[PDB]
Amino acid sequence: GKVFGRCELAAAMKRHGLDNYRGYSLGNWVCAAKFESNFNTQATNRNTDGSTDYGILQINSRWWCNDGRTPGSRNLCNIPCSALLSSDITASVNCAKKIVSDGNGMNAWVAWRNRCKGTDVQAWIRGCRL
Question: Would residue 36 show up in a list of annotated catalytic residues for this protein?
Fold first, then answer.
């Protein structure tokens, strides 16, 4: 397992191209992870509706990843949801990119919309080596 630190996650996300990706500066992505999962790569939220949110960015199994148990599955990231529980952030970052590339803002992430949008998101990367 793994729980990231803020700056460790910022650096990994930047190595994966997230700083300014589709108009979202790096702190947006760190803030989203903070409030979605508290940086826990294995965070898993199982919803009454039968879908589940997986990993550090709490990506959902209806549209985005396949867990084989969710009605209406589209698997638009073309990954098993297990890949979103990895200690390495590859699948989560690539799927987060795909979400935005499929026409969704960051507003897809409830924690970003509710905790991060409009704030000084740069604070989430302040003092980090990048």
Answer: yes
* CA Rg value for the chain: 14
Catalytic residue among 19, 53, 67, 88: 53
**PDB resolution in Å:** 1.0
Please indicate whether residue 53 is annotated as part of the active site: yes
Which residues neighbour 120 within 8 Å (Cβ) at sequence distance 6 or greater?
none
Question: Is 16:89 a contact under the CB 8 Å cutoff?
Answer: yes
Residue 130: exposure state from Cβ atoms within 10 A (0-12, 13-18, ≥19): exposed
- Annotated catalytic residue, options 8, 19, 36, 49: 36
The method of structure determination was: X-ray
